[PDB]
Amino acid sequence: DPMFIIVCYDVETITQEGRARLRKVAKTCESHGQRVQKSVFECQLEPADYLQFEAKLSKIINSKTDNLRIYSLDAISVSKIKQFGVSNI
Amino acid sequence: DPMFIIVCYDVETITQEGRARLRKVAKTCESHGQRVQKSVFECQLEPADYLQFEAKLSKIINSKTDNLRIYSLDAISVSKIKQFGVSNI
């Protein structure tokens, strides 16, 4: 029943403004899941809550600069997640 | 019949060696799909070819330094894939 969501956020983290945008997206995602890369998060949601969550992240980015890509997958979509190398940050 | 594959490669791009590792992953993924973000690619492969592909990416990375994450999905609707902002390289 619960949706599995991969959030991929490409934003510059040289400027304080850009670091703050990434911090804000991280903090939205981490109350529904886990940070797996600097800018990749895995979340679980009831489908009912999805749209509000999508709007929340959307509103945070600079749409003239940044890229946000969200995969909203059915539970059964995913057969295998394979990790390589090192797991911190 | 073929699997949908999200490749997420988190590598430092401060050193020439690190930029080169990202370039080499990109070039492997782009003969099987599309670069959709700086460090995210979408690929399609028949199962037999998956393992050889997974080994090829694995071999390229610094396993002590980089993070490579491969999602193996059953085929999804394009409607499950949401984008916001621009594609700026």
Residue numbers in the entry:
A (entry chain A), B (entry chain B): -1 to 87
Could you give the paper's own sentences about this structure?
The genome of pathogenic Leptospira interrogans serovars (Copenhageni and Lai) are predicted to have CRISPR-Cas of subtypes I-B and I-C. Cas2, one of the core Cas proteins, has a crucial role in adaptive defense against foreign nucleic acids.
The crystal structure of rLinCas2C obtained at the resolution of 2.60 Å revealed the protein is in apostate conformation and contains N- (1–71 amino acids) and C-terminal (72–90 amino acids) regions, with the former possessing a ferredoxin fold. The crystal structure of rLinCas2C encloses the signature N-terminal ferredoxin domain (βαββαβ). LinCas2C crystal is composed of a total of three α-helices (α1–α3) and five anti-parallel β-strands (β1–β5) for the Cas2 orthologs enlisted in Table 2. The rLinCas2C dimer demonstrates that the β5 strand (6 residues) of one protomer bridges with the β4 strand (5 residues) of another protomer by 8–10 hydrogen bonds and several other residues enlisted in Supplementary Table S2. The crystal structure of rLinCas2C (dimeric form) indicates it is in a catalytically inactive conformational state as the distance between the conserved Asp8 residue of each protomer is 11.0 Å (as opposed to 6.5 Å in SsoCas2). The distance of 11.0 Å seems too far to coordinate a single Mg2+ ion of the protein. For these aspartates to bind a bridging metal, the rLinCas2C would need to undergo either a major conformational change of the β1 or ferredoxin fold region or altogether the dimer orientation. The mapping of the surface electrostatic potential of rLinCas2C demonstrated the presence of a positive charge at the putative nucleic acid substrate-binding loop (L1 and L2) and the α1 region. In LinCas2C, alanine replacement mutation of conserved residues Tyr7, Asp8, Arg33, and Phe39 and loop L2 abolishes DNase activity, whereas moderate reduction of RNase activity was evident in selected mutants.
